[PDB]
Amino acid sequence: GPLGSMEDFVRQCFNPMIVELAEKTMKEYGEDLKIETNKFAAICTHLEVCFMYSDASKHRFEIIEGRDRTMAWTVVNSICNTTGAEKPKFLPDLYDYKENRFIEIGVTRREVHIYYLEKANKIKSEKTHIHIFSFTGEEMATKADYTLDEESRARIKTRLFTIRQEMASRGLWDSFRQSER
Ligand SMILES: Oc1ccc(/C=N/Nc2ccc(Cl)cc2)c(O)c1O
Numbered sequence: 001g002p003l004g005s006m007e008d009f010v011r012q013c014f015n016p017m018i019v020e021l022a023e024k025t026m027k028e029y030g031e032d033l034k035i036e037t038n039k040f041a042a043i044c045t046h047l048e049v050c051f052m053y054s055d056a057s058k059h060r061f062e063i064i065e066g067r068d069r070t071m072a073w074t075v076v077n078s079i080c081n082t083t084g085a086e087k088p089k090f091l092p093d094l095y096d097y098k099e100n101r102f103i104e105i106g107v108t109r110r111e112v113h114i115y116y117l118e119k120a121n122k123i124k125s126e127k128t129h130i131h132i133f134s135f136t137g138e139e140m141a142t143k144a145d146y147t148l149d150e151e152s153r154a155r156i157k158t159r160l161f162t163i164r165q166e167m168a169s170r171g172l173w174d175s176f177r178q179s180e181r
Pocket residue numbers: 036038039042107108109110135176177179180181
């Protein structure tokens with residue numbers, strides 16, 4: 001019936017720190033969240049997934065996403081110097097200290113395999129590990145290595161389902177889904 005505001009939804013659905021980091025992200029790119037509200041939600045979603053992924057194993061992962069850009073490269077370059085890891089061409093989302101690799105996390109409602117192939121074709125690296133989550137609960141990962149166990153990943157998928165559900169109940173899902181890409 002009633003169609004809600006996506007900005008209202010974001011500020012209610014996501015933790016204050018995620019929202020703030022997403023605001024900083026958009027401002028850093030010169031974007032108005034009051035107009036590009038679906039993107040604001042997507043940024044929040046992706047940041048939450050990255051944080052959940054890291055939290056699945058505390059201190060196993062360094063978080064790169066959410067930091068300001070200069071600081072993100074500072075962190076990446078430090079990790080590369082310390083661990084000997086090869087420097088990525090584009091900023092990744094995490095660094096896995098156990099498997100010794102950077103990780104790019106994708107969140108999509110497009111077809112998960114195509115999305116994976118596009119990510120992989122962009123970053124080009126033979127080292128950076130890619131992990132894609134769909135709002136459908138589908139996932140795809142480099143070399144069928146999913147990194148975390150089923151329960152951790154289920155928690156992330158459950159979060160995505162809950163977001164899609166709350167959006168839909170406020171009439172926001174169709175627009176949000178369409179806005180991707
Ligand atoms: O420049 C942009 C303008 C709008 C968007 C919107 N993305 N929306 C979005 C992205 C991913 C999912 Cl799963 C659902 C929705 C976006 O991702 C952009 O990069």
